[PDB]
A paper describes a structure:
Humans have three different proliferating cell nuclear antigen (PCNA) clamp-loading complexes: RFC and CTF18-RFC load PCNA onto DNA, but ATAD5-RFC can only unload PCNA from DNA. The eukaryotic DNA clamp is PCNA, a trimeric ring structure that encircles and slides along double-stranded DNA to promote processive DNA synthesis. We show here that ATAD5 has two unique locking loops that appear to tie the complex into a rigid structure, and together with a domain that plugs the DNA-binding chamber, prevent conformation changes required for DNA binding, likely explaining why ATAD5-RFC is exclusively a PCNA unloader. We obtained four cryo-EM structures of the ATAD5-RFC–PCNA complex (intermediates states 1–3 and 3′), in which PCNA is in different configurations that affect the ring opening and closing process during PCNA unloading or during dissociation of ATAD5-RFC from PCNA after unloading.
From the disordered-PCNA intermediate state 3 dataset, we derived another intermediate structure (open-PCNA intermediate state 3′) at an average resolution of 4.2 Å that contains a 5-Å gap between PCNA-2 and PCNA-3. This gap is unique because, to date, all structures of clamp loaders with open PCNA have a gap between PCNA-1 and PCNA-3. Unexpectedly, the RFC4 (subunit D) in the disordered-PCNA and open-PCNA intermediate states 3 and 3′ is occupied by ADP. By contrast, the ADP in RFC4 of states 3 and 3′ is stabilized by Val41, Thr85 and Arg239. Superimposition of PCNA-1 in the cracked-PCNA and open-PCNA states shows that PCNA-3 moves by 30 Å. In the open-PCNA intermediate state 3′, there is a 5-Å gap between PCNA-2 and PCNA-3 (the PCNA-3/2 gap). PCNA homotrimer exhibits a spiral shape in both the cracked-PCNA and open-PCNA states 2 and 3′, but only in the open-PCNA intermediate 3′ is PCNA-3 free to move further down to enlarge the gap. PCNA-3 is made highly mobile by ATAD5-RFC in the intermediate with two ADP molecules, and a PCNA-3/2 gap can form. Therefore, the PCNA-2/3 gap could possibly be used for PCNA unloading.
Author numbering:
A (entry chain A): 866 to 972, 1049 to 1098, 1119 to 1195, 1296 to 1418, 1451 to 1523, 1632 to 1844
B (entry chain C): 1 to 339
C (entry chain B): 178 to 351
D (entry chain D): 36 to 363
E (entry chain E): 2 to 349
Amino acid sequence: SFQRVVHVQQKDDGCCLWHLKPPSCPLLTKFKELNTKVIDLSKCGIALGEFSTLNSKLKSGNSAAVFMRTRKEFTEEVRNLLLEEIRWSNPEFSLKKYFPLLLKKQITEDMLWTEKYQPQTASELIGNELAIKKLHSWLKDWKRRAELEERQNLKGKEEESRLCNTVLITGPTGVGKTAAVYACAQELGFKIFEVNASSQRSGRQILSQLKEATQSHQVDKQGVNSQKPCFFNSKNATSLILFEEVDVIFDEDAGFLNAIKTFMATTKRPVILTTSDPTFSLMFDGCFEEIKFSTPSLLNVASYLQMICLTENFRTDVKDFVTLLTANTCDIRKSILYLQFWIRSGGGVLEERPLTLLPKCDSGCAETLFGLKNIFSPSEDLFSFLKHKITMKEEWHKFIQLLTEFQMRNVDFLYSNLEFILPLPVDTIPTTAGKKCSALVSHCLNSLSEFMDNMSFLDALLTDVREQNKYGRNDFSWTNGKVTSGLCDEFSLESNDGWTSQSSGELKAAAEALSFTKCSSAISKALETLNSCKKLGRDPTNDLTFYVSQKRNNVYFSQSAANLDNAWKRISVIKSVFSSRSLLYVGNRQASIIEYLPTLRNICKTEKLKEQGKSKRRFLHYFEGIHLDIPKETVNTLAADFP
Amino acid sequence: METSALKQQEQPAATKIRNLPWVEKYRPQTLNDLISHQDILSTIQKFINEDRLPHLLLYGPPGTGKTSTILACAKQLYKDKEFGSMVLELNASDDRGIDIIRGPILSFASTRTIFKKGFKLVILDEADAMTQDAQNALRRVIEKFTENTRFCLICNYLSKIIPALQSRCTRFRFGPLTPELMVPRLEHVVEEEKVDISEDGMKALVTLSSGDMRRALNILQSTNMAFGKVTEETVYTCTGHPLKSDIANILDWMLNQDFTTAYRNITELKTLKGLALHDILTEIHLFVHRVDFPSSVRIHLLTKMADIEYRLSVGTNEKIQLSSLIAAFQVTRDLIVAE
Amino acid sequence: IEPIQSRCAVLRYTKLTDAQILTRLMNVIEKERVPYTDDGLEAIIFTAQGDMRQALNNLQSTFSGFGFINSENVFKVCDEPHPLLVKEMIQHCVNANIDEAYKILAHLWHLGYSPEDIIGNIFRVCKTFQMAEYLKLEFIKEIGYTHMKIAEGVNSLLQMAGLLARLCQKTMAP
Amino acid sequence: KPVPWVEKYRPKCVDEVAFQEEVVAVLKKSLEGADLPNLLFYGPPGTGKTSTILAAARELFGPELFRLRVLELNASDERGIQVVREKVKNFAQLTVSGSRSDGKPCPPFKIVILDEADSMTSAAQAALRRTMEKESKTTRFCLICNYVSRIIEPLTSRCSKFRFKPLSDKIQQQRLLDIAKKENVKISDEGIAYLVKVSEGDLRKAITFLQSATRLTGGKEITEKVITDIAGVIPAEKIDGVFAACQSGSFDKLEAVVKDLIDEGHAATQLVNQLHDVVVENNLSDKQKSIITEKLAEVDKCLADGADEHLQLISLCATVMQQLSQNC
Amino acid sequence: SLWVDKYRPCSLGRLDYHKEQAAQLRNLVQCGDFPHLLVYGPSGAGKKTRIMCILRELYGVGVEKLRIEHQTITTPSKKKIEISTIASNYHLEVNPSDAGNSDRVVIQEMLKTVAQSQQLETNSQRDFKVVLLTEVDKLTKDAQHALRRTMEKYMSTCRLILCCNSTSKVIPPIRSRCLAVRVPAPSIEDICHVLSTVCKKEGLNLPSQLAHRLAEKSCRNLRKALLMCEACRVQQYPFTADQEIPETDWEVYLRETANAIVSQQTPQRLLEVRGRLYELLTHCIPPEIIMKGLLSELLHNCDGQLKGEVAQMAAYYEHRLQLGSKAIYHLEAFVAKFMALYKKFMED
Ligand SMILES: Nc1ncnc2c1ncn2[C@@H]1O[C@H](COP(=O)(O)OP(=O)(O)OP(O)(O)=S)[C@@H](O)[C@H]1O
Ligand SMILES: Nc1ncnc2c1ncn2[C@@H]1O[C@H](COP(=O)(O)OP(=O)(O)OP(O)(O)=S)[C@@H](O)[C@H]1O
Ligand SMILES: Nc1ncnc2c1ncn2[C@@H]1O[C@H](COP(=O)(O)OP(=O)(O)O)[C@@H](O)[C@H]1O
Ligand SMILES: Nc1ncnc2c1ncn2[C@@H]1O[C@H](COP(=O)(O)OP(=O)(O)O)[C@@H](O)[C@H]1O
Ligand SMILES: [Mg+2]
Ligand SMILES: [Mg+2]
């Protein structure tokens, strides 16, 4: 067809703007002529190392240093000296209990350290002592019930007990839930029937092939009983049903929660559910005993890993393992497996360290874990390279690659370790000359204030590699943060960009590198003058020291500048307080915390100080006097003080 | 599924008595007929005739002629009795997930030919819309089938394609077509179609098109039908693009008058002509480097219109942003005019 | 997902050192008998930022397309904006000379390069440029700021002009 | 059950829309030939573009076929252009038989009314252009944008583009009088004038505020107070007090005034709008005018980024404070 | 069962102040086809009590029953999220902001299922189910666009009250179709009146001097006034006119922080103040609240020319703070820049 698409604009006569002419002013009539003459690039050749580190000289013999390390088996004396070093490092650890067990376990391999040093006994588990005692007592009660039923069977031919048939184990990943279940079942003679998400677990199939496990005896009550058949469909031994990652549910896993509801409903044998998410406790309906595994103490698992490496003829400092565990967020299986890799590779760095509290120490698994040995020379140390001045182009590209590696994890390496890296003294918390003191303090202050201006610019006006607050809000929030990973096989089909990630990581690396180089150089230049100030008799170094925490000082380097134990305890306190039934319908959460929470802390401390005065006991009857069902542990926690 | 029905119906489709799509009139047929990017086409001919065709990534702004080029190459490599047996054509029209890559692509690249023996070819138009996992399987199906079948990747945005996928193919950029080579084409179209057009008409036609002959033919087609004559005014009115006289008066108002007068004049002209402040920003920036200013004026002014172009993106009030645009000139240039 | 890491040992690989890339490229051109210049070596490595899969790919492309290795051939086949042009851009920034820098930026624009590879090349050229560290820090933060503008969607010549202007005014303003 | 007045009182036919003459002429000519082109309506919002296209579709088709043959969509989708393109493909692919009992058969092409045509990127708009050329004969579109300038050139070359200038205040004052007399509500003419001047030439927002005001009052007199605070329009003596605090020389009364504005619930955006409207038409120096207006612009950016109203207002008042007190 | 909820008004006529717009809301619910409402005002001004009063006026007293239900939804990026929502047989309650960049997701499906609930549950009371979205200022742009698509798809199926504190982050199309309700903060005398009312309802009698002092110290936040009054009750069984009205403990910890700010300007002082702000953020105080408090504290010692400069650098740095993700860097940048300015200022 091709009709005419006429421009219909309502041109009325007048308005002094419809028909316009170019202005007659001289500035806008002076249009400079445009020139496209570029410099010719065929004449100019690119030199060697012009845009990179192509140096004519090349290093030979520094790299390719093969280890070929033969670990001589430690004698009794040096091993006992290392045991006493571990004991002096960790005085609260019962060392003499766990080392003969490791020696028995160790006594051409084809099998991992996780199953080599797999705990056979529940007492051999590390951390979560209350939880393992509760689980062991529950299984002792259940095996006693099974034994009593057997005695009743041979003799023939429950509100007081509250022996609930099912227990939910919850905790973080790799803390040893499956290991503790295996250990206690092996010790008490239980036969575990394992149900995993890796196998087919549909309701009809699991019911038709697992109901008679709890509705009957066992055909082989003697002999080969402590083996664990993974259930799938492609002394007398009591049955024990185990359900690993009940939280992982697929569309193929149809009617699984109803199925397990029927199992717990009709069972006569103990059933154990284990998972990692905290949310499974609320969405699942039923009667079940709950067991929580907290994150184990860092020093205990550090001593345990150090005994493990001692058994394999390696001596290693505690602080390196503390850094490794905090990097893994105290994950036992991660640290054990990476230790197995790093040990069987021959160790990282051979450096002698004479400590009494002998073979050479093997510190340096922390920087090997982060891949920093792929960047630096084996002679180079991390903090040693950090402290000196960076001028060489190759050294500065290695520092760029270092920051690029830490910014892929969205971790500010330079700022989380700013006190340990700045050219100023750092210590653990327990007149014209004065004008020069204040002036040097002012130059250092201007340098650091400029640095915080820069890193504020890198937070806001540089993008991040991974988009923060993608599924929750910013950190330190009591709303949610229980963002469980996906459960479906359908792909994301998203339209994200990847160029603005690989480029952005280098962008923030370069910006952070140049800003820290500038501020460190400025602080060093200001501190060069401090010799004259010391000669003048005044020492402003008390104004220049940095007061850091003891927990942060125990590590070689920190990935965070904050306390997460405090964050976890506050967040648990607030979540438990606003879980109260009276305050369960409050809508405005920021108003909720910021208004009710300080006032409720005032009421808690007022009640505490009233009880401190030997006054009437009815002062204890305020919260229950207005039906505030707030538990006494939380009341005591909020009545301590405001930190 | 399908959508090749509409293309095959569309190729011999016209009223042929009244409709006049002159954009569809002038189509090159082969590489000797595509009179542009001659180094690229001769390189393709060299790689074809040596049986040394590598994997290809044809990328550029749309309309520069990638699809017709690779269609000509496909018809050159293989005759019409075996074209479907050796070349697979796909695009983002049939998007069902990553099942395309492991479905027709993986099955097609895993087999020999049917009738005659030779190397095969797959063209993937608009491959920028393939997801990251789809491309990440596509790299594997290239790696383990490279000796049998060559791959052609038609794209528009180079950066989004994952680095290994660009790594396994060579790349060809279809850049903008230079005005000195595009004036004879439009002159030929004008003399063949008896069109009256002045030098500002040619300048506006080549400036708005930004090195694309399809878009130029579209503009001249629309202007010729709407007015019967083609000039700078007729093209810009038919395009609804900023007239240079209008934005010149806008610049004159900021550079001569005071704040309130220039403000209300520019507001009335935006209401009168239907202009959004993004295009005023673009055209005044086009005027800034042409009009003579000192260097300090240039850096200050460029930074301020850059920040205004930022602030216009989030969706704030355009009124205050116009006010700040006038303020940018009022701070420096009019103070120096007072000086 | 996290438990897959937690049941494994994870190891890290880095972008490769340029000396190592240079050794492997001289090795492969020795095993292939490739005529070359050093110009081609810095070009072929600059096109492969630590990823020598690109190095061998564009090496094969240069040898198949021209048969000799020099910078001009590499930039004809890889089709990047020229390193010398963007080095000239940041050199004009050091001199705070807006005119020429904008002129050849407009030249790259009508040459047809995208906003993203221009800003990336600007990054990787003012990275290793020989000039003062504080002004280098300012330049890096500014080009990152403009790169966020392109990344958020707005990618125009006005954005690069304001980029260049703030770069140039960094020199004159102390 | 009931409908808002904006579609209840929009004209049924073209020729019933007022204040537009060439637009009515060309749309009527295109309706006479029963081949409406692809339309591109540009102008300020509330000018009646949607009303004109609904009237044209009601005239060309049957009222029972009108809703069948139109699909009203918007184009700033947060899920991308692929979703709305799939909906367009679904609507064009799906065909329902249609006829009129009035004696004239309907044209075969359908109508997809896609608003906010000035809000997309060039890539999404080019994808819409490919969708346009996919369905050139079987569906003719009407793109409604605030500004025709943001339209990329392949669309503007194949669409009949129509300017919709804002209506002079007398004619929509008469229209609002018609609405008031047909909706049995007691309003003074001063109230209608104030509603017009806070509507700022937006008839659609004016009648929306009118219906909302008559359902707030429940038949009472529509005062100037209710229409002052139904549009969020700040009282002017608050603006005068802000300027007096800036002229005064004390930051304490400055923050006291800002506290008075924020605890009243008055938003910072509307305050910036009226502060700008005062500053642009004042006797202030163009240096001060420029500094204050660029401060206003960046404050608008800051508040759009999620910053506090209070902080941005304190900093804005500090800048206006310093600019006024420099000359004093 | 504190004073704010036990003595909360239940119907529109039980409101004590701002009677006029309460009567206008009564007219709105009398008309019976109200469109979507946006309601706004400062915190503690009485927005939520007005919302639940017009809810109770709207339906029967089945609004007054409330439970909690939990919703598990897969993301478009295929990562399911679990959220807690307050629910009733007639209304729903969602605060979407806990989903962060997934606020958009929390926009559709629940409301879609509420639409489905409107297609499922029939009671012949009214032709829509209402849902309160809380803190809609923290909704992102794409979330607000998804809300606009939801409302222009389900206008005949469900309704929504939009509780916020500022309509600045509300995009103008959302402001265009929802009726604005400005809820100003109560005056001092109104706070004293309702405070004496709730004390007589508690059987307690206090002097009016305590009421006026408490009203001034609450700064027109009625919820804070009632909570604090209850704190004064816990402090003393009888009410005396010179009873020490207690101070908010994080507020006074912030005050001692500001004392450390103005006292000494040393890098050790910067680091210990950084640790104090760490303690505050582990106490989950919002960063803008911390900032407003600390600037209002430090401005009392600032001189006239310093006050304005502190104002624009505070606004600029908090603009970056909302632009930024981790507020620590921006807060420390502000405090160090104020160190620089203040040290530069007493030295001359
Ligand atoms: N507390 C511990 N004491 C001793 N060994 C442990 C401990 N925690 C973990 N391990 C070791 O790490 C291995 C893995 O532990 P698992 O029990 O499989 O982890 P988990 O607690 O089940 O958490 P999941 O299954 O990854 S969510 C065990 O087999 C042990 O070798
Ligand atoms: N250099 C050229 N000379 C002449 N016509 C050209 C040229 N480039 C493109 N065309 C025209 O463009 C039509 C199709 O070109 P395409 O290959 O579709 O363009 P493209 O670069 O692939 O980008 P698309 O297809 O628009 S996304 C041809 O039929 C020609 O009419
Ligand atoms: N010229 C006019 N004649 C009659 N009514 C009009 C006119 N202009 C606007 N209106 C009224 O104002 C409303 C504008 O709505 P709409 O068509 O959406 O405007 P726009 O499309 O410009 O946003 C219509 O409902 C109509 O009743
Ligand atoms: N008329 C009134 N009578 C008694 N208390 C009121 C009245 N108006 C408001 N309040 C109190 O003020 C507080 C304000 O809280 P809320 O209803 O959430 O409004 P906002 O959202 O403004 O904080 C409520 O706790 C309520 O108890
Ligand atoms: Mg396990
Ligand atoms: Mg193409």
